[PDB]
């Protein structure tokens, strides 16, 4: 689905400075808009560049035994400065995400990391007569993130009873080491409602699985790292409530 061939190595370093944050992207080109829709404003209180700056989650290590990783939005970003506050200080909140997953390795490492963004990704519990199941905390790992396995999501079933070989129906890009180091995903606000209760309902699910295994030349770095940088796009909330100071 994501059959692209930018250049191969590196050309230009174009840095994305949004407010206080500053990422230096591999380039910037090769970006996939989810369903071809940009995050707009509800057609409220708009905290702009204050609540629209790059927060970077924990960098997880990809090793020969790694089965994968998965996060939840907004959830992950609930412990990030301003956006975190605006999440716990409102009853309403709609905000998009520019998930920019960067992965650096040498011209001696091989593998394929596919980033699948699943809308409303409920995780493993063939309990139709009852989803949610796994407690709020077991369902919300936050910034640290949860992991797939061969609170138990089965990787080949994308952790939801649907073969990963079909996962490609969701918006996604394959970071294939020999190609791009970067992967760009802009997910617009998708929900059954106009605006919603961010603390309860999880709008998105970034899941990074390993398509090809990692193989480093003879002896090198036993493991490489993958970084997730996310940023709230066109964020609005209604309406403050007793700046409930902690």
């Amino acid at each position: 689905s994501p059959n692209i061939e930018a250049c191969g190595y590196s050309d230009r370093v174009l840095q994305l400075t949004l407010g206080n944050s500053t990422i230096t992207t591999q380039e910037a080109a090769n970006s996939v808009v989810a369903y071809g829709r940009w995050p707009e404003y509800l057609r409220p209180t708009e905290p702009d560049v204050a609540a629209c700056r790059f927060y970077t989650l924990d960098t997880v290590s990809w090793t020969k035994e790694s089965r994968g990783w998965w996060w939840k939005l907004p959830d992950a970003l609930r412990d990030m400065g301003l956006f975190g506050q605006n999440m716990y200080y409102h009853y309403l909140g709609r905000s998009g995400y520019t998930v920019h997953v960067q992965c650096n390795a040498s011209k001696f490492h091989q593998g394929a990391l596919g980033v699948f963004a699943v809308p409303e990704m409920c995780l493993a519990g063939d309990s139709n007569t009852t989803t949610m199941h796994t407690s709020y905390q077991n369902a919300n790992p936050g910034e640290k993130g949860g992991t797939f396995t061969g609170f138990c999501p089965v990787d080949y079933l994308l952790g939801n009873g649907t073969l990963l070989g079909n996962a490609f129906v969701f918006p996604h890009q394959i970071i294939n080491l020999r190609t791009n180091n970067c992967a760009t995903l802009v997910l617009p606000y998708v929900n059954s409602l106009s605006i919603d209760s961010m603390v309860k309902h999880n709008n998105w699910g970034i899941a990074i699985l390993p398509l090809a295994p990692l193989n480093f030349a003879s002896e090198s770095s036993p493991e490489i790292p993958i970084t997730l940088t996310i940023a709230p796009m066109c964020c609005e909330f209604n309406g403050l409530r007793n700046i409930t100071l902690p």
Binding site: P44, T45, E46, P47, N238, G239, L240, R241
Partner: peptide, 8 residues
């Protein structure tokens, strides 16, 4: 009525 934006 019941409104909470962030105006002035």
């Amino acid at each position: 009525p019941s409104d909470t934006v962030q105006t002035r």
